[PDB]
Design a protein around this ligand. Structure first.
Ligand SMILES: Nc1ncnc2[nH]cnc12
Ligand SMILES: Nc1ncnc2[nH]cnc12
Lengths: 244, 244
């Protein structure tokens, strides 16, 4: 049976904006979420697909985007149970490692993702900590659209301690972010097809810092990312979860 | 109006076991959760209180308890929405800092909790990262039962990098754990009264003993913790959210 509905999970609404504009998605007023959360949702029908972009929104106290693994998981759970999707995709900008060939503005399709900041020095619990997992296999996509593939490492810090560096290295990650691994975990319990797409905005093992290189590009890349997601939606439209 | 229902959130079922026994709580078979999660629930009626202990259970892949901020938040959300409690309490063992006077087996009542492993080097986002917050004020409890009070720092790692150490220091934490901050976040969105109780099983600033603090003490303290929670339940029974 063909894919009908696709739920997009984005940490920052800024990252999704362009897509929302090109597809002319409308922000759902009555969200199927609890009256108390700050989550926002944008629904739309592109060709034969019900596209839904859900974002954790802005923190009710600080007024800043609620990034991180905790809000990312809560949202992914709620969305799954609510607008039960056929395919859930986690997109957003990220850190790249040039050592693994990551240029700025590159658009990778995460293959396997794990946690680099959950170090539990215990026999089996340390594997749980890393909690590594696969993404839904989409060879025709990476092939057709000819995209870059790589592993993702997730952590609640935007910086990178020497401890994070060693683990990201043990994960063999090419891209680095703050929520991917968390999303994959939830969708995995409800066993729903999942895809993670990351736009490189900052070269972590590079010279230029991790905070200023990120800002002067969260426009240039956030743009390239959009252009890319569209063509991805465009590719799925009409297919079955296996034709991907 | 008096407190009617109390939901306990515990990372490990081992930690709660004793309490479950003394109160003779029964494990709910039909949990109000999705058929796919591995969460377990124990319900019971102690005096005039509907006590519910909810645990994320054991990982479906690794078979180890699903500790950490992600499972702790998911569970806290689901329970709130499900068995809508009047008071939610987060109990469990933790790391203590003797520098702040924390002896092994001590039983503190967290005053303020924050994250020590979500370092985001950005203007307002770094405050979000720490995401510090207060616990429900219970002076009569700490007064009557004469308990130890202290701040809690939360992080997804059981070890402690030099980076975690500096932040736990900036949080002025006396106790250290892996879920508290996450629980307080969820309950705070639904604005429900919340309490965090931690049993010190390991002195972080010490020598990290033998097969004691890591193995024995988790029995010796998990015991003292139980004895303590009971007397806490016992104190609340009959009171209003303001009499605590
Ligand atoms: N270097 C980085 N680490 C984590 N998340 C990021 N998002 C953008 N750049 C990042
Ligand atoms: N040292 C420690 N750090 C974090 N969580 C703990 N739980 C028990 N001991 C701990």
């Amino acid at each position: 049976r063909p894919i009908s509905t696709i739920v997009f999970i984005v940490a920052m609404q800024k990252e999704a904006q362009p897509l929302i504009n090109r597809l002319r998605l409308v922000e759902e007023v009555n969200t199927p979420f609890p009256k108390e959360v700050t989550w926002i949702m944008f629904k739309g029908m592109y060709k034969d697909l019900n596209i839904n972009i859900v974002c954790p929104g802005k923190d009710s106290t600080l007024g800043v985007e609620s990034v991180g693994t905790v809000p990312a998981s809560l949202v992914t759970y709620a969305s799954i149970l609510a607008i039960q999707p056929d395919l859930i995709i986690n997109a957003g900008t990220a850190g790249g490692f040039k050592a693994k060939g990551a240029c700025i503005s590159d658009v990778y399709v995460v293959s396997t993702v794990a946690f680099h900041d959950r170090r539990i020095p215990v026999p089996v619990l340390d594997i749980y900590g890393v909690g590594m997992r696969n993404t839904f296999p989409t060879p025709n996509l990476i092939k057709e659209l000819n995209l870059k593939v790589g592993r993702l490492s997730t952590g609640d810090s935007m910086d990178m301690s020497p401890h994070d560096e060693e683990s990201i290295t043990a994960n063999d990650a090419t891209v680095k972010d703050m929520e991917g691994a968390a999303v994959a975990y939830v969708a995995d319990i409800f066993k729903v097809p999942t895809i993670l797409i990351k736009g490189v905005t900052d070269i972590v093992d590079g010279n230029r810092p991790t905070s200023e290189e990120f800002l002067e590009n969260l426009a240039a890349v956030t743009a390239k990312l959009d252009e890319s997601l569209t063509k991805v939606i465009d590719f799925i439209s009409g297919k079955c979860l296996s034709d991907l």
